[PDB]
Design a protein around this nucleic acid. Sequence first.
DNA 1: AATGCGCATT
DNA 2: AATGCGCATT
Lengths: 441, 441
Amino acid sequence: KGNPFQFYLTRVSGVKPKYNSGALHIKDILSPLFGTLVSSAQFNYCFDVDWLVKQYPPEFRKKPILLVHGDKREAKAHLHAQAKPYENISLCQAKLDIAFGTHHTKMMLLLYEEGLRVVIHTSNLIHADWHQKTQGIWLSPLYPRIADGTHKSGESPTHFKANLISYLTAYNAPSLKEWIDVIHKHDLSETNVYLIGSTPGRFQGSQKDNWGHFRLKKLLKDHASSMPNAESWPVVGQFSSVGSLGADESKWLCSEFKESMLTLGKESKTSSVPLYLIYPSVENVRTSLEGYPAGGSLPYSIQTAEKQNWLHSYFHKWSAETSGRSNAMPHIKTYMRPSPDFSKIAWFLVTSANLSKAAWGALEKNGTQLMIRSYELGVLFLPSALGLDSFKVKQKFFPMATFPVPYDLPPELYGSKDRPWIWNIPYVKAPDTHGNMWVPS
Amino acid sequence: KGNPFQFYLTRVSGVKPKYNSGALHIKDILSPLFGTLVSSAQFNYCFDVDWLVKQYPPEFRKKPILLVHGDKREAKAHLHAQAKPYENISLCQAKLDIAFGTHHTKMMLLLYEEGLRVVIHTSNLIHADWHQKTQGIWLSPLYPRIADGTHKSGESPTHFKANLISYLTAYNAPSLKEWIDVIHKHDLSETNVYLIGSTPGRFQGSQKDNWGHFRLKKLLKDHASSMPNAESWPVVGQFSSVGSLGADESKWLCSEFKESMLTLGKESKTSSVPLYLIYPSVENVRTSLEGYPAGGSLPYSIQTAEKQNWLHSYFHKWSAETSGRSNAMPHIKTYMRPSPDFSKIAWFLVTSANLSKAAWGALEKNGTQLMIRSYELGVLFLPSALGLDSFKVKQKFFPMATFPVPYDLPPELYGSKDRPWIWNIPYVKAPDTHGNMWVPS
DNA sequence: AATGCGCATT
DNA sequence: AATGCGCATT
């Protein structure tokens, strides 16, 4: 109605309604309000198909859905069976030819009579993920249909229409060529965000820029401006899962991943740019709204963790008084570049992607190719596409073009008592919010 | 003539004859003195076939030799061609089915009319290795032939006859069954050393004890005695090549390799046992008898080295005034367990084996199997097989059963200036003994 | 889940 | 030199 960012969280059961006024539930997303639906498409990793269908309004529940997943075999047959009762639901397996890869992108295409809406978010399609957790949502505006006679690209300065199409053609699934053509007939020119995809593969030369962290690096080179005293502006990475990052920080994180994030403006330098990583403590999960059960969505393995204790001295607490979400655990992923006083940020990103090489990609064969395992997707917010140099941090979440950060800044470092949440090991010592212990059976 | 150990060095050209009285050249080994030869066998890694043949006395030069190597293809055809002129020389390639494996064992079998002599040493069969270097030699005594009528094992308390046979059958080469039967007809009972082989493969259960460092561990359990204050007796490893030992000391060296070395007596404990590794500095090679050319036989690669700078704080200088060999570089390998004051040693080993997992073996598939790449071989000296508790270090090399250590004790740690010798990188800064620089072309 | 990258001598 | 061990998700 008023604001430029179109950036929202999910409704959280069990907090003061102060905080959920201006958040969204999935039903609010699929409301008649947002136009008379014709068909949808749902990209995601996990699906409760019965629950999902109940989230659409009765008026629209018979209209086609295409589900886009990466599952195979028994996971596949369970999904296919779970969707058998509904004659309007179709499916599209997306090809995951590298191992340990996930179809992790979370996105709704929503076709109406009145236009198109694209929605990029961070929540799985199961009840537990929209209940008591802290998630991220971006809404496009309604994209009007292009008149049949007229000839217009329907493109924005951020090249979003063209960046999104490239993302979908990369699948090769026939079921999506329908959704490419749908997008081609629609005017996407009002879009003020840049798209950031990861798609699986191994990419060489000029192709490395297309996906992953080289994509972010390129965008930041071409569309960010180098600030005075830039080296003192830190990086902040926020996530719910942790992949294997190697033997020490030089192997990937503080070399290859951090380079791409700190890039700003065309001129390149070749640092002590502080990196603050945010990941819930054991104690943040203990005192949570769910308690230890929140550990269900925080899958840091003990085997992965003990390999890399070096990482943990970069780890800071979940803390989100600005949203009243300190006890609603993070399944959102975000990355941003603040000023040293944290009053302003050069850019913000929300995405599906975790702190993993699978998701962001990592280099192979001596710097020549970039391998990515997983499908991911996010939107980047840049001041340059709003005629600004920086955003200003909304000191409290809920006054014009000041960006709404969901967590508290500055991040607070782990105490000596603190260790990170790990779902493999049993927490038997102190009980959770609801008087339970944790034994991963 | 007098002594019990039978432990010698090679003659070194360019030192005071004080030091070479009581050392040996290869011709001294193959002399008529040691019996009228019938045929020999020569196990080794590198061979100069023309030079070799010239080391035998003219009287014996026509008598059969079998060469035992691991080379294949062009290395093979070069060797086969190089031995073509001599109708008495035969060959035996030994099978190296794991990759990066070497046939590294250095041993002479020497058949005479009057008996058998086995000789286990550390020098390759090329002129450069017997010239100005510091090497190790063990001679058996003359093993008399067993009378055809009599029935006697010909075995010693150290089970050497049986340990050696097992070593040769492990090859499967038909050419060696002749040498097994030769050994079977001979009395090896006077042997006061234990044999220590590495042969290539992957070994499970009770088989792990047969080879490598599990072999040493087993021998030390069964035939050494646990001293009072044993944890304060250090370990000392001396070598010319360095394999890849992993990301840190826990991966192999200070866990798996060091355990096996410090074992003593049946009772097991489960430490700060100091480990002193001896490897020439850049400066030890610079000031050497050869100069930088000595770097030819010290093949520590820059790629291997930079992976493991942690190792280098265990590194001590080559220093051997006791032998007048400080400038003759080490191609010998030795390991031993001294007392904290270094006056006495629990045991001594000379061997072909370097500080590598290839040579010593390392564990796979979670502690169940031990993999070895290479063929190696040494003799272990134990006081228990001489009715003693310890040896006493010969304060100066050249008074009854005091053991002759070739290097100076205690070892001296690297200075801040010092770095290890590495043959990949160019030493262009200060000239060597003969006014040359080093550029590895 | 099951492919292909990186590794390992003297 | 060219085999097979170990690795990599949310």
